[PDB]
Amino acid sequence: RQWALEDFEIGRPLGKGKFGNVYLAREKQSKFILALKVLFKAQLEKAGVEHQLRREVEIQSHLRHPNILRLYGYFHDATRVYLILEYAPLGTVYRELQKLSKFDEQRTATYITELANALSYCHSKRVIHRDIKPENLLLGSAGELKIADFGWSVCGTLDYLPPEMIEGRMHDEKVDLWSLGVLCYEFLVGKPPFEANTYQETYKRISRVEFTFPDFVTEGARDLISRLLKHNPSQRPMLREVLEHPWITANSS
Numbered sequence: 001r002q003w004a005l006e007d008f009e010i011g012r013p014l015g016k017g018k019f020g021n022v023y024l025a026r027e028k029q030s031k032f033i034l035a036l037k038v039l040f041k042a043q044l045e046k047a048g049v050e051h052q053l054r055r056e057v058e059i060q061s062h063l064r065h066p067n068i069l070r071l072y073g074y075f076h077d078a079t080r081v082y083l084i085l086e087y088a089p090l091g092t093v094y095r096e097l098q099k100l101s102k103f104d105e106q107r108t109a110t111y112i113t114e115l116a117n118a119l120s121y122c123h124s125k126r127v128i129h130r131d132i133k134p135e136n137l138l139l140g141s142a143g144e145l146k147i148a149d150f151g152w153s154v155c156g157t158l159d160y161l162p163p164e165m166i167e168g169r170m171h172d173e174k175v176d177l178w179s180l181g182v183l184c185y186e187f188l189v190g191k192p193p194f195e196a197n198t199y200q201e202t203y204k205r206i207s208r209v210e211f212t213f214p215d216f217v218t219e220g221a222r223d224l225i226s227r228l229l230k231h232n233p234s235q236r237p238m239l240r241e242v243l244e245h246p247w248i249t250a251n252s253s
């Protein structure tokens with residue numbers, strides 16, 4: 001409860017964002033290691049999401065799950081807000097991917113699991129994430145997926161956002177079964193299923209729902225992705241169904 005910008009010995013920057021950045025930091029009394037996210041008040045409104053933050057902070061801190069990154073506390077000074085976040089030692093599913101190009105079945109399978117279960121829970125507890133992309137996943141020392149950033153849970157790249165949303169229509173929590181599908185595809189193939197060179201065609205690709213599997217994609221996965229990526233929210237499985245899918249279990253952990 002209420003720390004000050006002076007309980008913190010600040011260290012390596014972990015990420016440089018538009019609104020703010022995020023640092024390695026250690027609380028001086030406890031020697032605790034956290035990610036100190038430092039957002040800037042000025043821009044949050046010059047953008048308007050000052051409230052899409054009121055959501056992340058409230059939503060975050062109230063959640064307890066091994067694959068969701070913990071918000072520990074928060075305090076703003078006069079210039080900016082600070083968010084004492086949990087620290088994720090292995091970095092992002094994003095770098096991990098650029099690093100390795102493609103993930104294997106077991107790895108992809110496991111992550112979808114961790115993300116499924118983590119995602120189920122958010123849904124058990126009523127909440128939907130939406131903005132699930134590789135940039136927002138982090139890895140613990142154990143090496144396990146963890147979900148970060150919510151401010152978008154209750155512009156940029158369309159790549160992971162389902163038809164409904166994008167097409168404006170009111171949306172629910174199928175959103176995330178769609179991402180979970182794109183997510184899945186991206187891991188196994190390395191690009192997301194609706195990759196394009198422009199915002200324009202990418203809209204097309206997602207709305208017409210146009211994607212094609214590389215030769216080395218297995219049917220077990222092939223099938224999985226195809227029931228996550230249906231244009232109609234209704235025809236999208238529940239996470240329990242997902243965790244059931246065979247490929248998803250004879251390959252997870």
Ligand SMILES: CC[C@@H](NC(=O)c1cc2[nH]nc(NC(=O)c3ccc(N4CCN(C)CC4)cc3)c2s1)c1ccccc1
Pocket residue numbers: 014015016017018020021022035037069085086087088089090091092135136137138148149
């Ligand atoms: C999801 C993006 C969001 N980020 C967070 O909330 C974040 C929360 C959070 N907790 N821990 C982090 N740690 C790291 O970012 C990290 C990155 C690379 C690392 N390695 C160095 C090289 N090595 C070979 C692998 C390990 C280790 C830790 C981050 S980022 C964000 C939002 C606004 C502004 C900045 C960042």
